[PDB]
């Protein structure tokens, strides 16, 4: 599986990402100045956990939808069997959602974009999940320091999803072979862009898994 050919793989992945990222980077950057007032924040803090949750769960389900679209446009993903398609999405999707959040986060003032404006962690107080929210803000913050280009995220999240060590896989070797080509592609694009430095700054092995184990833990869905 050759080199001119991983060059096309890099371009292609980067395109799928761009075609499924839901909010454009430009808009997020532009809207940074648009912050929630002291009153608009109080409004959100007054609502019940249940209304926050509805709003949050709808935004998540749309985001997952986009992640699933992204996967479906990566080379070879659609050629894997259905059970394997599912096992990779079930295991990675919310991890990708989480990494995609860092583009909507603003290290200047510890704020994130949500429903048309930018807001600190206190916006989400009726959820009663200060610990979890707070550790999402910290992961988003130490990711914002890498100044991850859009293409690096696309390649990195392609590797979040395409992972042959997910328990449950049945054609492991065909996943391995997609994963390998994607790893080379990321490496090679880092070398083309002089950005090899970022490989050592990326989430320690398992930081993402365990933040997702913790996140998936709220099924407020049950009620
Ligand atoms: C336009 C818009 O608002 N989009 C939007 C909003 C959310 C969104 C949707 C849901 C969440 N929250 C709050 C949760 O994922 C969540 C929950 F629903 C229940 C308990 C704990 C958590 Cl973190 C958050 N958080 C978590 C952390 C406070 C920041 C932003 C963010 N998303 C995600 C798909 C990226 N996209």
Question: Mind giving me the DSSP string for 102-147?
Answer: GGGEETTTTEEEETTEEE-GGGGGGG--HHHHHHHHHHHHHHHTT-
Spatial distance between the Cα atoms of 77 and 196, rounded to a whole number of angstroms = 27
Return the best residue to mutate from 136, 214, 222 for the ligand 1 pocket (most ligand atoms within 8 A of CB): 136
Instruction: Locate the ligand 1 atom nearest the alpha carbon of residue 132 and give its number.
Output: 23
Spatial distance between the Cα atoms of 186 and 159, rounded to a whole number of angstroms = 9
Map tokens 């050629």 to a residue.
Answer: 79
Dmax (CA) of the chain: 57
> What CATH number does residue 125 fall under?
1.10.565.10
| C-alpha 71 chain-centroid distance | 12
Ligand 1 surroundings by CB, under 6 angstroms:
53, 56-57, 59-60, 63, 97, 101, 112, 114-115, 124, 127, 129, 132-133, 136, 218
**Burial per residue of 66-101, b for 16 or more beta-carbon CB atoms within 10 angstroms, e otherwise:** bbbebbeebbebeebeeebbebbbebbbbbbbbbbb
* Half-sphere CA count of 114, side-chain side, radius 13 A: 20
In the chain, how many domains are there? 1
Spatial distance between the Cα atoms of 120 and 114, rounded to a whole number of angstroms = 10
Spatial distance between the Cα atoms of 67 and 21, rounded to a whole number of angstroms = 8
Phi, psi angle pair for 111, to nearest 5°: -130, 160
Find the distance separating the first CA and the last CA of the chain, reported in whole Å. 49
Q: Which residue segment(s) compose the domain that 61 sits in?
A: 1-223
- H-state helical runs in the chain: 3-18, 25-30, 38-46, 49-72, 82-101, 130-144, 150-161, 172-193, 207-215
Residue 217 burial (CB count, 10 A): 9
171 within 8 A of 87, measured Cβ to Cβ = no
- Closest by alpha carbon to 9, among 153, 197, 188, 160? 188
**CA-nearest residue, atom 15 of ligand 1:** 56
175 within 8 A of 58, measured Cβ to Cβ = no
């Amino acid at each position: 599986a050759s080199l001119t050919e991983i060059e096309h793989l890099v371009q292609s992945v980067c395109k799928s990402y761009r075609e499924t990222c839901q909010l454009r980077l430009e808009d997020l950057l532009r809207q940074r100045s648009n912050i929630f007032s002291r009153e608009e924040v109080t409004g959100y803090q007054r609502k019940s956990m249940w209304e926050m949750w509805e709003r949050c769960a709808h935004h998540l389900t749309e985001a997952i939808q986009y992640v699933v679209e992204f996967a479906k446009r990566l080379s070879g993903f659609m050629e894997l069997c259905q059970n394997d398609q599912i096992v990779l999405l079930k295991a990675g999707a919310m991890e990708v959602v989480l990494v995609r959040m860092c583009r909507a986060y603003n290290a200047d003032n510890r704020t994130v974009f949500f429903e048309g404006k930018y807001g600190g962690m206190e916006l989400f107080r009726a959820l009663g999940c200060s610990e979890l929210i707070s550790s999402i803000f910290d992961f988003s913050h130490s990711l914002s320091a890498l100044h991850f280009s859009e293409d690096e995220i696309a390649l990195y999240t392609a590797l979040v999803l395409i992972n042959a060590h997910r328990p449950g896989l049945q054609e492991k070797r065909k996943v391995e072979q997609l994963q390998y080509n994607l790893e080379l592609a990321f490496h090679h694009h880092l070398c083309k862009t002089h950005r090899q430095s970022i490989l050592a700054k990326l989430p320690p092995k398992g930081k993402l898994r365990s933040l997702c184990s913790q996140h998936v833990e709220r099924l407020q869905i049950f009620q």
